[model samples]
Target: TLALDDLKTRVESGEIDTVLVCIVDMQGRLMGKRLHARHFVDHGWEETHCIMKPDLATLRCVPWLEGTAMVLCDLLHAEVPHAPRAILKRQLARLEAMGLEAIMATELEFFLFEKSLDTTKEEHVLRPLRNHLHAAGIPVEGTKGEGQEELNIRCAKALDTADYHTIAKHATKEIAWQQGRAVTFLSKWHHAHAGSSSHIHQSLWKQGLPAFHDERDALGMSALMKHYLAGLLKYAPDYTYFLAPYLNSYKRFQPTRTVWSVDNRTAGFRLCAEGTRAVRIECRIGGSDLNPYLAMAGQLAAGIKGIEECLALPPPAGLIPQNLRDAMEALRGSTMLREAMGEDVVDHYVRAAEVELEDFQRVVSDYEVARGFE
Candidate 1:
């Protein structure tokens, strides 16, 4: 029997009471239902219903949709599932079969505007009320022009509560995270700032020992590690749609800036903390507004492709400030990705991005209102 059916049966037997039926939406956010344990077992799994809020749009502001919306679904029961889920599950299974356990950590960072959501909505303009550390574990009283050490202290506290081992605070438009096991949130903008983001770090283990750790390799990377890196490089361009789904996301990919490190950031990937098995490919392309499902799926798919093909990964590139426009072209032109992912899956993402761009182009922004309206 399919694993999902097994899951359903387990739920039916009262083994599991609550079911989180989630859909990875356009902004790469998880939007779905938390079905009651009994309800899910009774009928929710066959086909469940949920709201399709207008806020599903990028930037969390919905203006074009006429009314609040909802949708229905038959829980996906595919061998590979969708993009990221498929990759994560498969990798877990592979590593587990090899007697490995997987562990993950994340770092989330964001800015708290002085103003609340209600105030900003009334003004039709977002101005900082006062930078307050709301709901975060940091003690950030306010934001300065570029940096804040106090804010880092507070964020470190939040990471501590979330069980993240290490935390660092950097001055930027908004919040970012290094994701491990716990769920966390960070935004680049709550008011006046750019946005927030969650960054993830992961590794595998075998019987409680690190599977990726190799003290003797030339670069300290095992064959498995190199193959995984190869997969990520090969597929990163194709997955750009998931990481940078909206026009604003592209803004984060600027040239000659620390925010956008080329071959490292704007180029769509970076090598972080090598030597230890903790080595990984850091995809700096994602914005504060992404769905974990899509982002993780993209990562998984790339890794799987690497293992399957035994692909050879190139050495990390030196700082090569890349342009966002070029990165977009690379995404659209990757035949390797198109072939690996197939038309249906690729088209689904392509259309989602196209819709976002079209919608944005059709509307005027505050910048236009100030510059052209008068």
Candidate 2:
């Protein structure tokens, strides 16, 4: 951990100039103010009056940007009580109270673009950079290249997993930029392209034992696991906004159906590594563009609710929310979400969805102009 005093020494020695006080927005993008290093350490570092609190554990010297350091911030506002990180923390606390912990990993798939938004007109290559990424402290398990590139990371506890996801995402952008390329985590880059996805792998542990595993069960799923899975499937519609948050995000959902099945990629949720300690549920509904904190929080809340009620898992369901508007409505109507994540938090996200839809509605697209111009 880098201390504030050490950072001050670096500033005094002219080793560092700027410190980025970043907070993840609803869209999962890092947004923040860059402060003069000296001023920040003197005034903002330990002050609670600031709107954002920097998480020191996340402080790192930016390898891509010169003389700069970055720290992730937690949003602090009385009205916005359901900040993404806070929501995840609350759910983790709920699991802790129940004598369980969530182990999670996200499979982040993205495409390397040619530094231009026009992916259809430009050709790109999926270059290997495992060594560089790993050197940067990103836990890269492996990489695969098809039309799009996939980067896999090893699993960790829920909060740490989310932190890794966020860091890996930032590292991907930085590393790509260093290599004279750009990467997009967009759900669908173009109609013809395969959509990127952030498939989430989750399991529960109790007393350091895999709670999801049961050797007596045919599928190795404990009753607790079944209830959690039941909650996830039942309330999937309610949390779709967190997974697929944009207008273009809906495009990916149509091609990949939302049924949960064993060892099936087409399903919304797939049971992976059955009859083993690795047995877990992989939620395939989340697009690459999802905010990890929000997505994990939503899943944890749903699973917790299921456990509390001892809900039974239903047979494979064939549908999920198909559009952003429908997802917003589902979020609005979810009593479970409202209870799990207070009504204020739920409403805040609903309004965020509404604003996104309103912005898109006001814009005229190229497709609309091209088709009607003549």
Candidate 3:
């Protein structure tokens, strides 16, 4: 809850001396410079890497750090339309203009290794980590399991969900290091281990009420909900790059089909709280490696298109790309995405896919080395 006014007051009172000016990088990691409290107040906010500006709404204290306040920034002002936040901002603005808003929540899952993470201190897995995040202003209801890591931020504006994920992901690493352990969000880290997922739940809202619900309907799905879900089904492949960006990203048991089910885990889209005001769709196609902003924006664009064209909800669906190569191709050829998201944005991600694929292929893995003995 570090508002600009509050931050300034604390800085003058000598309670805070450092301000973290940060930007979300391509990997969805925080990267930026630290400014002296006085310099930041004087004009540091105006001058930043990538010509970005700090978003005061995202300002929160880094409770783990002394005399420090952290503020996430946006390159939207730099006109970097291809950036994650910029792309998502545009999509959310479109929803706002349509008299609609998206209420989003994120369930980010990862693993803790015995490299070695122990917390009697934990009374459980990472109690310290949870407390650290809560103090940082992220409202974490709780963690997932004893040793595993999974957190779902509270319902928020679509863009805010991405901010929360990035912060928590970064903080998890810091917290893990402090306790002499290692943590990873890699979707598929070990061949024998289950892959991690980042499931996102979405629902539309208007004027403070849930717009996706229809009490008269048997399943409580409004007309708007059907169209939005249809759009999500139809264009899922086009946005696969955002969902599973890396080569191993698809190795996870990510929902490959765009079918929806009632509280069932198999479908790519799981219908939650059906026939109620809490009705929403949980997209389980995304892996831990996915950038939340990009993934959310791509899904939002599809939903918007569905609403615009009154897209008929087909009986069911599946056309997900098999790998990064297929995903990039789908992205490049998508007229729906090209129009919904910018050409530059899709192209930028396509290139990134190629770079990742190429870089991966050039490496000689242990599997290849072992097989050569044959």
Candidate 4:
């Protein structure tokens, strides 16, 4: 962990020249102020223009950027209570109050699109930059051909996992940019190409003991685990807005394409590494473009509600909503999410979704012209 004093010493020694005080925006992009190292360590880092402070534990050197360090901040604007990180933090506090902690990780997938966004015809072309990506400190687990890549980061307590995800995603974009490649987390960049996904793995723990484990059970899943999964499946539709937030995001959910099944890529929720300490639910419904904080928070809230109400687990999972309009409607009417996330938070996202839908409705696509010109 980098401390203020240690950072000050480094700045004085001329080893680091800049510090980035960053907060995650609604779109999951990093938005922050760049402070000269001296200015930051001296007086500029503390006072809040927005209300919240940076979490010092998140301080780390930005290897992708020279002579710079970055730290993630939590926001505190009264009107922005539904801010992604704040939402996750609220859920974590709820779990702590319930005598449990969430252990989670996210598997992110994306495609290497060409630098130019207009090259729709080259969807099948592959750009091999994984070697340079690995050299830049990205944990690349593996890659399938056709420009598809997967990143797997170590698991952590709920909040840390989100932090790691945000940082890693930021790094991926920077590193890919330096290589003259455009990295897209879009669920489906093209109809002919494979879709990208951000699958989440989650479990619960209490006092350092895994709470979802039962050695004698068929799948090593305890009653608590069943209830949590039950809640996630039951409320999947309500939170689908967070998982697939945009119009293209829903396009990736084509039938038999991204549904849920046991050890199946097509399933929306998959049981992974069953009968062991690593046992957990893998939610595959989220597109790669999902905001990590909101997605994790939504799932945690659902699972916690299930535990509280002891909701019974349904039979193996079914298909999720296949379009943004349908998902938005489900979100609009969800009492579970409204109660867990607060009406204000739910309404904020619903409005955001409606704006996206309205904007899309206003534009006429090239496909329409191509087919109707005759």
Candidate 5:
């Protein structure tokens, strides 16, 4: 069994130069420190603390959950030093025991504005869109107002940096990636493009075998698979903050926008390239501003809960002609979420959402100026 001492030796040997000490903030950003390997190994390991309001904004602008605030305390190392590494130790132990490996590939998409952020704000005129893709330090593709190629390039770049080799682009879902200069990912802007959503493909494996695949089962999904998905759906609201953390994040959860699809783009969740072991749920919920660790943590936590309890899953909703209000509503009221994740965790996130909403409510916009000033 590999002990903490073994991990420390590896760190001391220059095998790991940077230890990313991270916390999943209210905004779902990886907010933490990158400690020097030496300091982390010798001193900083035990525990770390982050401010309650690093960014200093309330939760009104964010939708869904409301009335709460949070501060994160993350464990950096082992009992080899100071503080409580309880959460961190448990996370590591969980991974080791499952013998399951995680693979993630992100789709980063953003519209290219002709004017800088400052310029756009000063002029009050919408910027022009330019879609271009830079691959491995080279501009390999261009869509100029249609950013699918650019998005592909971004995905390719992200894949290159990840240790896990399971990364690929949505080759056929080209239109979904299109962009207009004025198309902001922010939801409050009436003129902004619907909103940008990033769909993630996730799977777990053990000793070269997929834990989710069962060829004999219909839909190529095993009982374990159903349990995993059930957990996701059941606890989606509890963790929705991770997927849509900011005020803008909630904007994409609206109907007719941010919809998921089956090799299509009109829905909130979709089944990706079915058949083969690749069969997975595509959460068309995440935005560009997401913390990968937190997102993965939420997913892993939910899946583990399902696997442990052998949770019964509701049948797939099939194709959603309209928006999935029930799912969203169910997430909001999930008592199971409170039970699984604790009331403090749920309350903290709800506070984050409330802060965002409060912020947005206080802002007076261009539309008001244009119509009223005239």
Candidate 6:
């Protein structure tokens, strides 16, 4: 946690000289301008990847550098906003109006491989990310998986969680490369290897207290919580594209059914901390390749829709789309997400799926060539 006055002091004393003004783009990666601290303190204080304004709340000291600090940003835009941060912020405002805030955390999984290409300032991001790492006092734990590592970060409000998740995923690759290794956030890096996923844990809070909790209920889930879950379940197929963005993304550990059960990982939406105030839904459908802001916005939109409609929470799970082809079709057809996320935003990603599908179709995969050549 860094304050502006603290940054001023460091800058005045020449203890820090650079501050990275970053934007969280659609793919949930940081792209920005690195400025001299003098410029940041004196002039460029409110500015990109351009058209972005620093969210000073995310100000932090970069312990890895001689004198460095960084802040995340919100895209400056108007009229049918499609920017990732803007879209999530739109959903957040809806929650705020309803007297609720989304408390969220992420479980990001990726694989470490030997040597890979990079960006986010291809050379610049590598040195610092691998050398010094901290996301402002959040506890980070590393869980070993089958040729993958699952990084768990502490819960935070909507924007902060997205910001932290972006940094964490980027750093994993940068750090892995320093050991002469590379990393992949691909859902399924290979057919033989287990898929990596980014699981979302979320709940609603009202003015600092858990709104999802109710002691009178046997499972401690409030009616609001049930409505929220129903929203998530009812629209799971509609938002499945955000969770599974690519062809390969759909291959590993698909969302078989849109249902929730207490502490059940088998269902796409798993309920955690049953009979307690920590009750929230763990969405297991998102692949590692999914973008946090896009995916989270999609979830909130669906959940809010459910609440507004007072949708009934069903006892059974229903089938979700099986592939990007299927996901694209559902997304294109769904009127709910269009109203919630905007028509342009919906079509922009639908076009992305078409681009990916067409590109794949135009080429012969190694699998196809190997199988057919013989």
TM-score of each: 0.57, 0.89, 0.95, 0.89, 0.57, 0.89
For candidate 5, which ten residues in a row score worst on lDDT? 56-65
Q: What is the C-alpha RMSD of each candidate to the true structure, in Å?
A: 11.1, 3.4, 2.1, 4.0, 11.7, 4.2
Which candidate number maximizes TM-score? 3
lDDT of each: 0.45, 0.81, 0.84, 0.78, 0.45, 0.80
lDDT of 4: 0.78
**Cα lDDT, model 3, residue 285:** 93
Q: Given candidate 4, what's the lDDT at residue 64?
A: 66
Clashes counted in candidate 5 amount to: 23
- Displacement of residue 73 (Cα, Å) in model 1 is 9.3
**Tens digit of per-residue lDDT, candidate 5, span 1-374:** 12345446756665645554444433333346766656655765555455211221100110111211111234332231111122223333465487865444555444434433444331222111112112112222333223221233222212121211111121112212232123233322333454555556666666777677888876677777677776665565545655656655655555233333355555455666555787666666676555444455555666667777898866433321122233333334556555544555555545555666567679886768799977
Q: What's the lDDT of the predicted structure labeled candidate 3?
A: 0.84
Q: Which stretches of candidate 3 lie over 4 Å from their true place?
A: 76-78, 116-125
Residues 65-164, candidate 3: write the lDDT tens digits.
Answer: 7898888777752567887888888999999998999989999998877686454644233786788788988888877662466876787888878888
In model 4, which residue pairs have backbone atoms overlapping below 3 Å? 259-266, 259-267, 259-268, 260-267, 260-268, 261-267
Off by over 4 Å in 1: 1-22, 33-74, 77-103, 119-195, 205-209, 255-273, 308-332
Number of the candidate with higher TM-score, 1 or 4: 4
- The alpha-carbon lDDT assigned to residue 328 of candidate 4 equals 87
What's the number of clashes in each of the models?
37, 0, 1, 6, 23, 3
Model 2 lDDT per residue over 51-145, tens place: 78888877766645677777777777242476788888888999999899999999998888766333322222223345544544556787776
Residues 119-200 of candidate 1: C-alpha lDDT, one tens digit per residue: 3331221122122122122233442222111122222211121221111222122222111111122333224444444455
* Pairs that clash in candidate 6: 16-67, 113-182, 115-182
